[PDB]
Amino acid sequence: NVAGVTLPVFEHYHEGTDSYELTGLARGGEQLAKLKRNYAKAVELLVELA
Amino acid sequence: VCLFLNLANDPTIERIITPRLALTTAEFLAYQCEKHVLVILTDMSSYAEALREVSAAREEVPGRRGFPGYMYTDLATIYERAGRVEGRNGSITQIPILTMPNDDITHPIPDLTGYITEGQIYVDRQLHNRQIYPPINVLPSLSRLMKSAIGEGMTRKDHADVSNQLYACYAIGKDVQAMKAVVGEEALTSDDLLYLEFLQKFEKNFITQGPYENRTVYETLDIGWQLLRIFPKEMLKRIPQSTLSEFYPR
Numbered sequence: 001n002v003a004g005v006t007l008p009v010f011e012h013y014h015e016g017t018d019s020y021e022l023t024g025l026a027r028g029g030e031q032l033a034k035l036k037r038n039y040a041k042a043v044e045l046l047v048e049l050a
Numbered sequence: 051v052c053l054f055l056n057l058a059n060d061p062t063i064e065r066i067i068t069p070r071l072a073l074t075t076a077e078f079l080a081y082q083c084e085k086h087v088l089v090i091l092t093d094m095s096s097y098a099e100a101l102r103e104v105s106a107a108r109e110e111v112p113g114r115r116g117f118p119g120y121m122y123t124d125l126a127t128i129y130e131r132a133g134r135v136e137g138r139n140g141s142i143t144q145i146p147i148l149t150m151p152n153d154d155i156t157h158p159i160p161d162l163t164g165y166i167t168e169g170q171i172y173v174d175r176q177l178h179n180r181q182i183y184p185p186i187n188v189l190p191s192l193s194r195l196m197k198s199a200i201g202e203g204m205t206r207k208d209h210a211d212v213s214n215q216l217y218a219c220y221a222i223g224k225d226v227q228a229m230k231a232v233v234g235e236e237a238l239t240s241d242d243l244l245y246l247e248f249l250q251k252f253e254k255n256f257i258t259q260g261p262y263e264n265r266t267v268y269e270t271l272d273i274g275w276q277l278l279r280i281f282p283k284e285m286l287k288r289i290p291q292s293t294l295s296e297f298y299p300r
Contacts, residue, residue: 001234001236003233003234003237004232004234
């Protein structure tokens with residue numbers, strides 16, 4: 001309710017079903033985890049922008 | 051206190067003879083006893099009506115709005131008997147009262163009265179309707195000699211700036227309440243709440259006095275400074291810094 005007119009907004013939700021686990025790609029899970037962190041932060045900022 | 055009464059029962063012509071007696075008495079006291087008299091006239095609308103009836107009985111042709119043409123001259127010869135006289139230690143001050151039919155500011159009686167006289171003071175229906183006594187609406191109330199009536203010596207040195215600041219703060223507060231009426235109280239700044247606080251306290255204490263609370267000028271300025279203390283001196287941009295270093299930190 002920014003003013004007399006109300007505008008819809010959004011919220012960042014962690015639903016709960018964790019990000020999946022790929023441990024077989026020649027054993028490179030660490031890089032995948034830091035990439036997960038990067039894109040998670042990006043998506044947070046993006047929902048704010050939306 | 052001298053007192054003159056003319057009930058509405060008494061003859062209508064005595065209506066337009068009471069003022070002349072009162073003014074003659076005030077003159078004799080002022081300039082033959084060197085006193086300081088304050089004459090207060092009530093309900094000049096009834097004076098106008100009585101004068102109208104005298105004119106119509108006298109068969110004269112009507113003027114504007116049914117009131118006679120020379121109402122201007124008559125009210126002039128009533129109001130003009132005052133002031134100060136060189137070489138006499140005395141004065142006469144006039145505070146006539148009158149009612150505006152239909153709250154109409156362009157009615158002839160208030161129009162001519164405003165033209166002849168200096169300044170004006172209002173009372174507003176809404177303020178009385180807020181159960182505020184005396185319901186004195188300062189926003190359209192003016193004055194003509196305020197600049198020279200007050201000054202160092204005869205009063206404190208901290209009057210005119212205080213008046214300007216109170217008026218500016220109150221006008222900001224009222225228009226700001228008008229703004230918050232639609233902008234929503236959530237988008238308001240904290241200084242905005244300070245302006246609202248000034249509005250409510252000003253209408254709660256400065257204006258409301260009660261029928262017997264005999265306030266002096268010095269008490270009035272004390273309450274004015276106390277109301278001004280809410281904000282910092284930085285917002286109080288009508289006060290000179292020289293008096294800020296003295297009065298604001300009290």
